Design a protein around this ligand. Sequence first.
Ligand SMILES: [Cl-]
Ligand SMILES: [Cl-]
Length: 162
Amino acid sequence: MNIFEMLRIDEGLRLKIYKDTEGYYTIGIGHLLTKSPSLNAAKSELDKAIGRNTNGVITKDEAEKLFNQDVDAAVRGILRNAKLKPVYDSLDAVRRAALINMVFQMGETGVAGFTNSLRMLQQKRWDEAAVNLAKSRWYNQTPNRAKRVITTARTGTWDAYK
Ligand SMILES: [Cl-]
Ligand SMILES: [Cl-]
């Protein structure tokens, strides 16, 4: 398992414009397009992202291409963030994947705000971190996914994804 397979499980794959768990227009493997309520706006943003007139539909390759960019941007965002980087650098490889997933889902900003969980993770206080991470809107809104990612961070193993 790796980061890509992990997020592909969490986000799924849809070839047509859809609304995510928050009601926002998205496409592919969780590629958010816009927070705006306008389908046209979403359509405009999709065509600009792809490079062609898609009419709200993309191919599998195009979806994977956007996912690749999105995963890359997630890592680079961690690495450029003064609160995130040091956590990330202290972790082992599986736990790092948990942090990338969160960032992909909620943005650098949102994740950089889990101050307390970040410190416990940096200190290797697994169980405490896990408890702290679950005290969040994130977990109350998307609990099945949150649980998988939290167990990943807590155990350093991929069990939640088997
Ligand atoms: Cl883009
Ligand atoms: Cl969920």
